[PDB]
Amino acid sequence: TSILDIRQGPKEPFRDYVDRFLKTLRAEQASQEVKNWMTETLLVQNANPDCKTILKALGPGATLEEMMTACQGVG
Amino acid sequence: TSILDIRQGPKEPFRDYVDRFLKTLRAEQASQEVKNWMTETLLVQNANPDCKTILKALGPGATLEEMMTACQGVG
């Protein structure tokens, strides 16, 4: 019930993690601008090590769709 | 009025930035566990370039007091 608790499994597809992250985010008490910032930063911090390293290599400013494209088939 | 808007000035002492960050955080609508996570991650992201680089070199898990010690006299 906290967005801080949604972490990607070591063999979970990135998009099934994003599904659980966005459903939990909808329930989180925070401003819409803080939710949009979590979607960029917390989604990367809570990714599994293989996706995390790919996402750090895109850097900030990657959109959510760009992040998902970069992680297809990883794990 | 958003915590995302509190950024360190290029010549502002780190502790005067932390003062403005903690006063704004008190007013932010979010859970206490999300406030404690902002104090570790968002405080580093919104630091000025010279403090930011010192704080990244401490890594995660540095406490707020450790972060402040590492930034004394910078700028």
UniProtKB/Swiss-Prot annotation, chains A, B:
Q: Where in the cell is it found?
A: Virion
Identify the stretch annotated as signal peptide in this record. Answer: none
Q: Share the record's PTM remark.
A: Phosphorylated possibly by host MAPK1; this phosphorylation is necessary for Pin1-mediated virion uncoating.
Region Dimerization/Multimerization of capsid protein p24: start and end of each range? 1-75
Quaternary assembly: Homodimer; the homodimer further multimerizes as homohexamers or homopentamers. Interacts with human PPIA/CYPA; This interaction stabilizes the capsid. Interacts with human NUP153. Interacts with host PDZD8; this interaction stabilizes the capsid. Interacts with monkey TRIM5; this interaction destabilizes the capsid.
Biological role: Forms the conical core that encapsulates the genomic RNA-nucleocapsid complex in the virion. Most core are conical, with only 7% tubular. The core is constituted by capsid protein hexamer subunits. The core is disassembled soon after virion entry. Host restriction factors such as TRIM5-alpha or TRIMCyp bind retroviral capsids and cause premature capsid disassembly, leading to blocks in reverse transcription. Capsid restriction by TRIM5 is one of the factors which restricts HIV-1 to the human species. Host PIN1 apparently facilitates the virion uncoating.
Write the protein's name: Capsid protein p24
- Organism equals Human immunodeficiency virus type 1 group M subtype B (isolate NY5)
Full protein: residues contained: 280 to 354 of 1435
